Amino acid sequence: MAVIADPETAQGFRLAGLEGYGASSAEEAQSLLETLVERGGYALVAVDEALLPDPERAVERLMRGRDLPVLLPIAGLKEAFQGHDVEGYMRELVRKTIGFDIKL
Amino acid sequence: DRTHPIPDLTGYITEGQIQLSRELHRKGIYPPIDPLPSLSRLMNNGVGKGKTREDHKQVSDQLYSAYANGVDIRKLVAIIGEDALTENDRRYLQFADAFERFFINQGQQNRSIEESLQIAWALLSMLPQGELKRISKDHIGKYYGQKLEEI
Amino acid sequence: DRTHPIPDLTGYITEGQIQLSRELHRKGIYPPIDPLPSLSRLMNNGVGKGKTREDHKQVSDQLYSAYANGVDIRKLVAIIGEDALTENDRRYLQFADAFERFFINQGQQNRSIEESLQIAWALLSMLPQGELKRISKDHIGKYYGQKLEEIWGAP
Amino acid sequence: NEIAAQIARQATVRPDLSGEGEKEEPFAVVFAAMGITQRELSYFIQEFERTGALSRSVLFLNKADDPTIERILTPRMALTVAEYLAFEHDYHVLVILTDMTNYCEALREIGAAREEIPGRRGYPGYMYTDLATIYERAGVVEGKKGSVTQIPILSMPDDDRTHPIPDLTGYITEGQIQLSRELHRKGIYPPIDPLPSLSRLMNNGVGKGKTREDHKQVSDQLYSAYANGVDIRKLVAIIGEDALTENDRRYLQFADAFERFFINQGQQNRSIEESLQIAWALLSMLPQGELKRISKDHIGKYYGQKLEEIWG
Amino acid sequence: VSPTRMNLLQRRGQLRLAQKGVDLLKKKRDALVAEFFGLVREAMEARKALDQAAKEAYAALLLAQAFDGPEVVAGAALGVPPLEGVEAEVENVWGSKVPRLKATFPDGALLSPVGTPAYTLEASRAFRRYAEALIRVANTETRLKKIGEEIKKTTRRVNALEQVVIPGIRAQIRFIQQVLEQREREDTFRLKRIKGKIEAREAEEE
Amino acid sequence: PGGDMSEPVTQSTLRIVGAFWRLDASLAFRRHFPAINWNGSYSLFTSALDPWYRENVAEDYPELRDAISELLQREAGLQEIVQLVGPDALQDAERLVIEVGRIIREDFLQQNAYHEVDAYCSMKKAYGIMKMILAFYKEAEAAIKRGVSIDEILQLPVLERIGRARYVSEEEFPAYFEEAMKEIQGAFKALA
Amino acid sequence: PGGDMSEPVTQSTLRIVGAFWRLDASLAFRRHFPAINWNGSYSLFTSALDPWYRENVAEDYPELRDAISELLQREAGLQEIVQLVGPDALQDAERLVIEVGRIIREDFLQQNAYHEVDAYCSMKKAYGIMKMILAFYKEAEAAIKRGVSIDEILQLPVLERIGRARYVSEEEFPAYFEEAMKEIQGAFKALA
Amino acid sequence: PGGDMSEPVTQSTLRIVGAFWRLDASLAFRRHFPAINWNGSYSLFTSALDPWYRENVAEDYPELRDAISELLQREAGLQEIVQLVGPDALQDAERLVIEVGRIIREDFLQQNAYHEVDAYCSMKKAYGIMKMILAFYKEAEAAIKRGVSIDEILQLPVLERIGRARYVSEEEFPAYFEEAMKEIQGAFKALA
């Protein structure tokens, strides 16, 4: 299980024994994600929302036949200490899953 | 049903027919005229240079093609939903809806041929300038661009 | 074919139809009367106080609704499985089975209206008091709670 | 017409397999045409000329420009000649009747002219007896060496098997070879749809000492496998290909390969041995347990050979 | 489809089966939607827990690099080698295998989790708990997405049945009915004409 | 005419006959003989012949026949769901019904008129095959309740014995039947 | 009456005529003229005219015609899937087949009877348009196997030139065709 | 006999009559009386009767009737969403549409034929009820755009007052009417 995020959290994840790498830009984040996903053995490849919101949207072309590696957007550190609308994320996910885009 | 003997035998005699749609009527569109089942055989002998405007026939054909595409994508969407569409298909759906709302639906207002063609070109402007295979490049240059702002 | 001229005109002149079921017949149920497609137009006049019992109509409506739900759930279980059904759904399933086995399958017995209503209330007791939305509370309190063993012990 | 001409050109008996004495007497052909177009007539005449079969053929021609009421007599005259040849000169005749639809059309004309009460779709109620008097003149006789074989060709008006002419013909004749338009469009020749086809007398001339010991069982297994393939074709239009089990995909591939390699043979003459070899090569695509209709002795003897060894 | 009475009855049976199938699939979708909207609540809770754990672990790390020099803490953190603890087992949900990350993640697997920094050991604990929260969020989200895809499949099937299949069967029924009625009319007309001719013949010649 | 069972002759025969053996074109096309349409066929002599069956074939023969009929009816019910979503969408308990119906229709109702042995079947042989099939169904249902997958239940070797029971001679069948029953019990005990 | 092809007159004609040019109301509704249904139409003169085509149009005209027919058949086969499951579900090869079928329909089959130039078409012009379409199809298939995207292929400029080839004059067509073939090679040379 | 509308008698009648009131058993099963469906019914007299309404009931009556029809149409359109996900899931605007539809159906379209007062409704009474409902809808849209949760809107007693408008006598309705309009304006202005 690996995490591509800001270096500050990436190094902490490494301190947790998990594979990890830093990120600098959206294109760089996508390149790192593609590099990780290309190789096997990685069941979970987390990504920051700040640099690459929808990891599936980015690396769908690779794992559609080898879906073992899960992708999971991870909270942005900048927003970590000011709060982020989790409700908004699930609203987007419900829209993605059922299409209706309806809740309250 | 067209296949009834009365409409069938009338169709073989008359020079076209203006068919009415119950769906458009239920949606509140007047006059509820559905272009696809409707035809005018003697259209080409009364439109063109010196017989209205030179872009009439090509604009009509392009409208028919675009509306047919929009209807097809509307059929598809009723099965698979809107999110699964391409941008091209989305533009065609929007064109179909705007067509029904602004071109077919006119109430009791009397429209000049120029006004109708202006509205038609405004609707065609919603599509990419390269999707208009039925209109020659000269006419597309001449008229493409206006927005839906007729008053 | 219910649209054949003979059934069509007969229904167009008569006041209901009791329809026999080939599925019930080939499952061993006798008499094989399918309640769902059956109808009796004049029933509401000949049931009530002073004729049958005051709870007849509502018991009949509840039986109809419960059997319909039971059949639908019985077809759904083939796909979704029993563990994915709610408890009320499983109760409707068991109700459908018991209804077919004890209400429709009476054989050559002769049942008075009292016995039939007793069996109906015993079957309805298998559903929670609260899903019986078509019966008034007085009738429920009076008759709800019998045991199906009254008929299960001697079908 | 192409299939009829091909059968006339290629048809032969096999005394070697059946044990009969070595003999190679060819068929005589009695060709009765009713309302035949110049296109079809030119095809038939040229084909018979090319195969050198006119010297042993008698042709009764009723073109489409000729009177219609003459058709009431053409099949009868042709079958009179065929029966004479067979049962008075020990011939093996093969009668081809081009369009029985046109014959029934003439029958209906005469019926309507007489103001009779018709049956189905205006055709006379005695059409069954009439077509029986025509068709039931084939067979073999005790104490005689000749034979008469009929291969009528009739066009189902709108590909409708329930039309009166196909229905009565099927009820009178000993099977039918039914062509399909779907196979034709794909490019398969001859486009024979095995499932609706039939041959009542197949059991008489196939088996040990006649063709081979595995003929009937192989035929039945082919029918079962193809029916399963068609059913899975129907299912995949509901569920999609990705959900098919391995066995279902095996049957689907069998149906496709069967269609493209067994039915589609072009204008090539196959001996029964080659046909059974291709059939076994196709059955070899299915797992050995799937061949329920075939005995294990035959499976052991013939199962295994790959379709590639024949083509590709 | 050949126009015949039995074909008409078969088409009518197909229509009834298609309608009942639409109803059955609608009930299936209702069950799926109930489960989906339970899973949405579960996912909300999981993401909230992940947010809390992330805040705690990041606060621990920041104070790890505040009380100790950032360079030393970063070197120690990067000194911990990567390791594998997740098991990618599969769970069958609604007839579809879905990964379940049943990770063990032993604490003794890590190497050099502590050193010159004092709190860096505690920081590793918070990040291990945060990895656990991440795995929980993964387990919730994956099955949520699978339920959503199943709902999409069911809706596609229901819409197909109601917009293509049933109208087609209705059209076929109408066509066969018209054909059969036309044939009956023709037969009646022929009988009447023949009867009239016979009556005229009787009147003229007896 | 045209296979139309709505023809006047057929309808006039429906109302005057005690048994109706309707043939299906679908079965005939795939060379499944006798090709009887089970759904459309019926017999009105069944109840009147039960004492004879009890005294001559077996005391519980009517029960076995009713069980087979009920299983076929359940298969007819489940075929609708199969055509709606497919065999794989069904649960194991219902796939067992589907596959037991297939086994009945391929190993019991099928009969080869041109086979030396299978051309003729006695009431005892039919009784034995029915008892084999029902015993297998009971064991398989009990096992599926224990958690064994239907894929394994279909691969057991005893299904070959049930399939070949048709082709066993009349003199051999009484021993083959006992062997098959013992094999059924042993095979399902082996799965555990 | 009613476009019904089962009628006495049509059925009587179809037993004699050597071709069958079936017009479709569905195509006419969408303004696809000549509105001939290429699935129901047939001709019995194709085999007899092959030598003339070989000696007067091109030595490989029949093969090109068969290629166009096969592409149309594949598109018809995939339409049943697309109308229910959506275009995106299909693989890249099927998507290319469908889009090339659209190109064949709109750029080759359709013909404007009222245009000054499109009203008529020589056999050489049809051969040129067919060869352009099939060359583009081969290049697109190779590119897709080479990892290029279908969206990229669908936006190439050369598609516009293929789409306007039918509006070019008879005297100007050979030059247009040479340039178009060169550009068909070049466009997928650049994509790599 | 079967309820099919393609029957010749129904088709001939609909060709000549000016209004069609589609009684439906489905509504009666839901205890909605009169069981007239507003999605299959139609009148061809409204345009000719507009001047009479403008002179005899109110000058704006036709527009109010059209607004009620538009609301019912909108609520019909939203059914496909309410079925998959309950009313609680819908957002505030769509929930307002659903609930104004419920209010219409229950307070204007339903009519107890056995009640002393509700059995008969004058045009003035209907116009008053429609005006009340539409004013409530306008204020509620304003509130939703102001941020008031719909669960708060549905608790207002003004809805209860609109519930009983049916049952007020003709000689008493005017008072009840201007009073209730004033309280409608009061409720949403006061509500935060």
mmCIF file of C-alpha atoms in Angstrom, chain D residues 115-119 121-122 160-162 237-238, chain E residues 2-4 7 153 157 183 187 190-191 194 197:
data_model
loop_
_atom_site.group_PDB
_atom_site.id
_atom_site.type_symbol
_atom_site.label_atom_id
_atom_site.label_comp_id
_atom_site.label_asym_id
_atom_site.label_seq_id
_atom_site.Cartn_x
_atom_site.Cartn_y
_atom_site.Cartn_z
ATOM 1 C CA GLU D 115 -66.056 -20.104 -58.181
ATOM 2 C CA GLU D 116 -65.169 -22.811 -55.675
ATOM 3 C CA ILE D 117 -65.043 -22.236 -51.929
ATOM 4 C CA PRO D 118 -61.296 -21.807 -51.243
ATOM 5 C CA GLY D 119 -59.272 -22.918 -48.254
ATOM 6 C CA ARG D 121 -55.417 -17.687 -48.783
ATOM 7 C CA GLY D 122 -57.627 -18.505 -51.750
ATOM 8 C CA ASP D 160 -43.075 -17.970 -44.381
ATOM 9 C CA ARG D 161 -43.043 -21.647 -43.409
ATOM 10 C CA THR D 162 -46.745 -21.454 -42.459
ATOM 11 C CA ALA D 237 -27.991 -10.357 -26.371
ATOM 12 C CA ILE D 238 -29.427 -10.060 -22.843
ATOM 13 C CA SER E 2 -45.063 -15.553 -39.092
ATOM 14 C CA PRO E 3 -48.606 -14.203 -38.580
ATOM 15 C CA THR E 4 -50.487 -17.024 -36.874
ATOM 16 C CA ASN E 7 -47.559 -16.737 -32.640
ATOM 17 C CA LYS E 153 -26.831 -2.191 -14.520
ATOM 18 C CA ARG E 157 -31.955 -3.289 -17.978
ATOM 19 C CA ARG E 183 -57.664 -12.677 -43.721
ATOM 20 C CA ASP E 187 -62.783 -15.135 -46.357
ATOM 21 C CA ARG E 190 -65.549 -14.548 -50.712
ATOM 22 C CA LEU E 191 -68.237 -16.635 -49.016
ATOM 23 C CA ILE E 194 -70.175 -17.104 -53.857
ATOM 24 C CA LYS E 197 -73.845 -16.069 -57.232
#
